[PDB]
Amino acid sequence: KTQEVVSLLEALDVHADIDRLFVTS
Amino acid sequence: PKMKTHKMAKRRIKITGTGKVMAFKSGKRHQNTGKSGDEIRGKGKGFVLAKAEWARMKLMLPR
Amino acid sequence: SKQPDKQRKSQRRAPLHERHKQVRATLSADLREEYGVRVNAGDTVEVLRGDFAGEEGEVINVDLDKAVIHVEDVTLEKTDGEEVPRPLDTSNVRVTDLDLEDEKREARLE
């Protein structure tokens, strides 16, 4: 869930985070 | 695309990687010349400088 | 509908009723919180903007045509004199007293 995203986010937010690139494998 | 006065490429005209070229002596003979013998001692190869440039060039690509 | 102009296209070239789509809005407390489906076009409203911002008025003529509406309040007087209804820009129409004494009005949106 994207709100779950909200979560991991709380886990490590930052401006670099703002950068933010989504990669799965 | 591109080409060579495929002609001069063929009659006279060849390159040694040196990036240089030769063609046949050509000073007389192979037409007139009741002329002589020792002169006949005149048809191995001729190496014309500088100009062997329009030359080389125009041929460029294959030969 | 995948480019800026097809908007006008479908909107007013297709269903004038789409223009009704325009009619869309919202209202007061009751009704609104209550939900958000079905309306009355001609209902009561207050203007939440323009100098007339925060002004009490009633919707009379649902005018999807010119793509807007007329309310008794939002009005201006001429120069010769006579007073008359203002061209009201959908954009800041807040409905509230939900026109419904009309059984059908009720049925549809409250």
Added chain:
RNA sequence: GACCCGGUGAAAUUGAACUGGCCGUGAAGAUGCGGCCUACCCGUGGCAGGACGAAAAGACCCCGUGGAGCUUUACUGCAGC
């Protein structure tokens, strides 16, 4: 008709210009370079000389291994015989 009046109210050429005569000079026939001599500011009716005046990127010329018409025992071909 021109000229004066009132009404009307174009046009080519034109870098720009408040633009003399001289004797000379420069590319070699100069209003604007030199020395000199007259020479106030504006205008309209005029007279043609100069502004190499206008009109036209010479049609007489020569040049571009330019064009198009016609000619004969020019070349090559096609027609018809």
Added chain:
RNA sequence: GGGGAUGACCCCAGGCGGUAGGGGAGCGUUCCCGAUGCCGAUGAAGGCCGACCCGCGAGGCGGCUGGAGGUAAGGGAAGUG
């Protein structure tokens, strides 16, 4: 060329008229980046005027204009002067 810290500074040498033309280096112009870039109704732009910056092609800036923008501290692109 003598050290240069990145500047820069110093000495002398050492010239530096320049068309075809060959080499270096900058300027503004409308676009694509908004390389952990966003100003503006107390003005975007363009306009209108100017005795601080640049060798300069330009900058800045202050004043008045006018209604809505669009900039990019950096590279990319070209119907560019």
Added chain:
RNA sequence: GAGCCGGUAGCGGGCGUGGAUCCCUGGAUGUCCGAAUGGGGGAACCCGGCCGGCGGGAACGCCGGUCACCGCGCUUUUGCGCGGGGGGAACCUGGGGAACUGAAACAUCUCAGUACCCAGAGGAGAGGAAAGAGAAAUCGACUCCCUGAGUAGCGGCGAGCGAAAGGGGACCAGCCUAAACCGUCCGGCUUGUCCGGGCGGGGUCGUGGGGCCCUCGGACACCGAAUCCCCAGCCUAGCCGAAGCUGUUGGGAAGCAGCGCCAGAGAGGGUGAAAGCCCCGUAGGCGAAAGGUGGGGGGAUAGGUGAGGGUACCCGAGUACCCCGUGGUUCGUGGAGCCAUGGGGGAAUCUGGGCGGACCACCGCCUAAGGCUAAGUACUCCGGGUGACCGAUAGCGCACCAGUACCGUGAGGGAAAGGUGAAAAGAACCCCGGGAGGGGAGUGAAAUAGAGCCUGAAACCGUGGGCUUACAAGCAGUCACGGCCCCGCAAGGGGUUGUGGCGUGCCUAUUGAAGCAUGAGCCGGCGACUCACGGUCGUGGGCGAGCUUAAGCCGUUGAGGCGGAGGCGUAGGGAAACCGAGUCCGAACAGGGCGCAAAGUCCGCGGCCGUGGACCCGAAACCGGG
């Protein structure tokens, strides 16, 4: 889903939740011309037979309907009942089929089988299962991409022109027919045994068919279509559809400020100035048909082919083949073939006959001289998206009473003109006036925003001021100094100039330029060394062996990845045989080429060169159809 009688705003009168306007599809009308076809004909108009009502025919007589051209088969009969044509921007193929220009001339040639004109099929045609290819005894539709090759080579061998089998890729599929033999028979000659044509036999894929004798053998193989309803795709509108208010500078706010939410949908637009939460019928996504077109995919329809040996053999063409005279081909008359034909000769049916480029022997290959064959490439009238594409002199020339206004006899040519405002609230009334137009008043955020009414600069015409102006040359001016005038960057500059010094414009092309040689009257906007593929040398940088096609797959953003035919370095010397770091000449140890790594290679940007209309406009003229 609740307004509407279209762009006209206006009047005058009206329709609708006993689902109106309108979106869609499927309807009837459908005047007259235009293949026009009933006849004529300067289209858009004028002429003819039957049915037709019966129409007024007030005690007097119609339109309307309808109806028939001609090329096409054939149930021929007396011919009834089918198909055609006329379009179409560009795409296809075939019929016909050119000068300029390059060769720095120009006759070969190139421009090209290009432009054009034609006939015609389509939605795509092209073409398309082999008398092929090539030769490793190997390959197997036709087409289209890359690659092969700018090779092999054509050639006043001069400009130039310039392939193909093989490898990689997309796609994939196959079927008949006369083909007399058989029989069926019809119709004939005139009965036999003849051809004849409708039926099957076979109705050939990579050679057999048929006909004789015995082995047969006794059910999953559907094309291009046929068929079902299938997701039949679409056909327009389908519909949901998350979440802020208070304050506040404001003419306006969506902005500043405070605090509140959304969220697989912070794509964009519309909102009185820039909002995720205001409008948005947007991206989140779900959505959805009674009509009109599929592949898939399912079925039967299913058409339809589908084994063995034998036997003296009969079984896809009218011409191949050859000789002349042309075509295609890369072939320009050539050592010069294959196919295609013009004209004359005029074969063979399986030991047949072409083929592998003269020809001859042997081999290898194919089986002509009939037909159909979706898909893989092209194209854009039309619909969608998207753009380091355009902004009204740029984009199509035309962003909206433009291929029309207008010169043309005609074929043909072919403009220019968008913006006020937030919304008219567009300007009652008063004022001069024939009026327009000017002044007031009211909108108003402003109307030096005011109706051709945004931003509206220059050229150029005006109106007020400073200075300056009548014994004086010059564009210009600019260096000096003085007088008068202003000191919003004051003891220094501003503007103007009286005098005085020195001073020949500007641009092209010129031995040489004020120029009296040219160029140009003014201002504003347009306007000229670029792109693409080659190649080249420079360099920035990634490996030295380095490097990429066509494609397949992955894709708000939509992400690149994988593809290993190939081609450039890795020795080269030669004409070649071929040898080879040696190599050609030659028979001589004499020279030329090379060896000597110094090694590239790909990509990026760049000076350049070849082909491109390719720094830009500029003529006479030749050719094509009209």
